[PDB]
């Protein structure tokens, strides 16, 4: 299967502007059929601050049918940016290219107030 | 040290 | 302080489904003011699978302004709902009971057709 | 374990 050799966590995958996740699996030690994901994520979003450098990225992935959720927190060695990121979705290894389809949520803050902000982001894998 | 930025959206 | 009594142990936190959420954080040794999340998810929300048992969580928190980000997959010994659920949110600590104000997604299949679909949940400190 | 198709439906 290709979803066999994502496993290995050698991959990476790059989303439409750019932006490079960096996966990295190891089998949960409770859940069946289930990963804890870690590895890194290189930002290179639009207007957007913390790029260029790894964020380490956390979360959990169910082996099944291919489907994952993970996160970062905007903070490291080179830039914070006091923000997290969550995205939410599936692999889809039918076509002759890979590709992970996500739904995000960022929370940050504007002034004093908070908000969450709403995206999706395709990854296809290099 | 790390720089600081308001959010990911904004410096 | 209220953010450090969160650092400090295994808070419980209830949505408007009912469904609780049970934060441990452990520092990061590579990001500054930032958290692994662990702990547990039970689900009680009404015409739902996996319900009622505990779901290990992942994810990382920022203490600099008490935003978080955790994930379940619905796999446990008790049953296995083939899905994972994201949230992301903010901890106001402002009014005299803490509330976790979250996004969430909910990534599943029906039949051979993947989705993904949004919601929002609001959890109240359990004290 | 139980198993269902997703969280939202048996």
Known sequence: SPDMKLLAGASNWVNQSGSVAQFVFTPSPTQPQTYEVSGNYINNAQGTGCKGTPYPLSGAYYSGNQIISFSVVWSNASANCQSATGWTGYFDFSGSQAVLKTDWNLAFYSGSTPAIQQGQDDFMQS | ?11
């Open chain 2, 1 to 11: 040290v790390a720089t600081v930025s308001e959010s990911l959206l904004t410096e």
